[PDB]
Amino acid sequence: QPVIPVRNIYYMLTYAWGYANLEAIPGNNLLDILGYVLNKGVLQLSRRGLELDYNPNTEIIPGIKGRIEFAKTIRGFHLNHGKTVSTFDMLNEDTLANRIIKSTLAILIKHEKLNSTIRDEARSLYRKLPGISTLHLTPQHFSYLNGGKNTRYYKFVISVCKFIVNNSIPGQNKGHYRFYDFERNEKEMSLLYQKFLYEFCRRELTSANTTRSYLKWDASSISDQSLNLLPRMETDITIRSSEKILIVDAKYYKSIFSREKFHSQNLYQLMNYLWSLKPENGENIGGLLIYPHVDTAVKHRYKINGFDIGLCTVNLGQEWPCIHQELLDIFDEYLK
């Protein structure tokens, strides 16, 4: 049952979310890492100042505040008991974004398997935010916040809040929670990998242009021009440069972690992407298969059907900088 050290995933999640010292914490497991980011992350915000959104308030008060609503006043006859219905803007920190932080912290404490200090420190924070009201979180709450009015820093911790709630399962007790075994499932780990690269390549490969490209089948059918039944095909990433184009397909498989047979079923998808894609520039066409391995990294090249294709691996579990060096080394070879 071999897996990646948990700390390294957080780095990939960071690029996945598109935006610190982790050596200090002694808990290798993820929630210890993830909570310490948040627990420190909240405190980092408070230094600068949390978001305060003017919420208009229409209420019945004994006097003039802001703009009086003449209609609701006369209709309810509130003048007679010395009151008016007036609209004014109380400034609160009770916004959806901040409510989510507080509700997330409640979930974090309730998790049964967690560092005690992490749980101790967070309980302070929950008390330190009296005005904010607890909420029962759903993805629909996060859906409303896709507008992204908030600052760039807020979006990072909220992304963490999205990860925690979805990857939280009740355990021994009804109240308490237990963390999901994220590493074991390939699909979510794989979907992380594909998104990890797409945002990563934009950062480092300033030389090349990095875009996801939709592809269209060359087919025509007398039955339907739509071709809906045909598989929808959208590249994982395309990283185009003037001298050479390159398509990459990346996936996480358990079989490859064992140093035997090889799982390369994804390759079957790849040629059709090369085929359906036709470049106006006509500089070259290349493909790449990249997978995660634990122990070591090996690079091969192939000349299959007039295409220059590479199968390669990365030794996750080594260290983040050499991994960062290794990736830049990787794309340097093929992007030429």
Binding site: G18, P56, E69, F70, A71, I74, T87, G148, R152, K155
Partner: protein, 290 residues
């Protein structure tokens, strides 16, 4: 009044201007969405004289929505008189009555920064009636504060409405999809690429190299801005209004003037825009000066 008079100084292409009148005359309600500094307020007063065909202010009405506008303000509301309250006809209701005095001559109501206010609250009854199809006596409706004696308020056919919603504040964006169908949305570009922008500068004592250098750098920046959508979307890209004004005295444009702009206005804007790494700020700031 005619198109040649208005379009002398505008930096927007003719293409959109025809697109506006094509969409306007069929649909009668439109929205121009763009970042600040692209002449949204500037074009709007000029357009009104085109459709009327004459430079008349009476057939035009101009307002701004300030996140405190109310149905009492726009249409029908109750105001204190000296001792007791009275019912007051709002401004739009006041405008339509004049507008239906003559169907022949077109009447325009212009709302700057319309996106702010909760439009469902302001319009109320009017949200349905504004549509081109649902106009005239056929779709007459009685209002909330109308008298018990049946008296009905209908949008005249001659009326055309224009709104000017900036695209920077994301929160203040129209999410009333029922309302967003009533209006037609016209994207407006920054206006750098056009020669009509450039000729204005060359006419005002500008070097074509310095001019062509200026647009080259802005277009690079707006692409970097346009690339992101997480925080800074396509709409955030910088307008041309900063460069337009302040040269009337005879101050010719040069790197001194551009450097004053970059340090004073845009560079504060950039650090607020990015607020992640100064190096990206230091990069683009030096690029403009170079």
């Amino acid at each position: 009044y005619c198109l040649e008079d208005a379009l002398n100084d505008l930096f927007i292409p003719e293409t959109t201007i025809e697109t506006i009148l094509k969409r306007l005359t069929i649909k009668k309600n439109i929205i121009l969405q763009g970042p600040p500094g692209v002449g949204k307020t500037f074009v709007a007063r000029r357009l009104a004289y085109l459709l009327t065909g004459e430079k008349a202010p009476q057939r035009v009405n101009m307002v701004q929505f300030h996140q405190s506008y109310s149905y009492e303000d726009f249409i029908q509301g109750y105001r204190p008189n000296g001792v007791g309250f009275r019912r007051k006809d709002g401004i739009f209701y006041n405008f339509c009555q004049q507008a239906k005095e003559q169907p022949e001559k077109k009447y325009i109501f212009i709302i700057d920064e319309i996106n702010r206010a909760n439009l469902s609250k302001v319009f109320g009854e009017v949200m349905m009636l504004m549509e081109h199809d649902k106009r005239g006596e056929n779709w007459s409706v009685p209002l909330t504060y109308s008298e018990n004696d049946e008296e009905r308020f209908y949008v005249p056919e001659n009326v055309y409405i224009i709104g000017l919603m900036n695209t920077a504040d994301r929160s203040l964006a129209v999410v009333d999809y029922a309302l967003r169908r009533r209006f037609s949305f016209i994207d407006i570009e920054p206006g750098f690429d056009t020669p009509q922008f450039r000729n204005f500068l060359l006419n005002k004592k500008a070097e074509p190299s310095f001019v062509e250098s200026l647009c080259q750098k802005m277009n690079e920046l707006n692409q970097e801005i346009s690339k992101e959508a997480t925080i800074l979307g396509k709409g955030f890209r910088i307008g041309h209004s900063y460069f337009c004004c302040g040269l009337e005295d005879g101050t010719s444009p040069d790197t001194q003037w551009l450097n004053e702009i970059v340090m004073t206005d845009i560079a504060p804007l950039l650090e607020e825009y990015f607020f992640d790494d100064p190096y990206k700020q230091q990069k683009w700031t030096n690029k403009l000066l170079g």
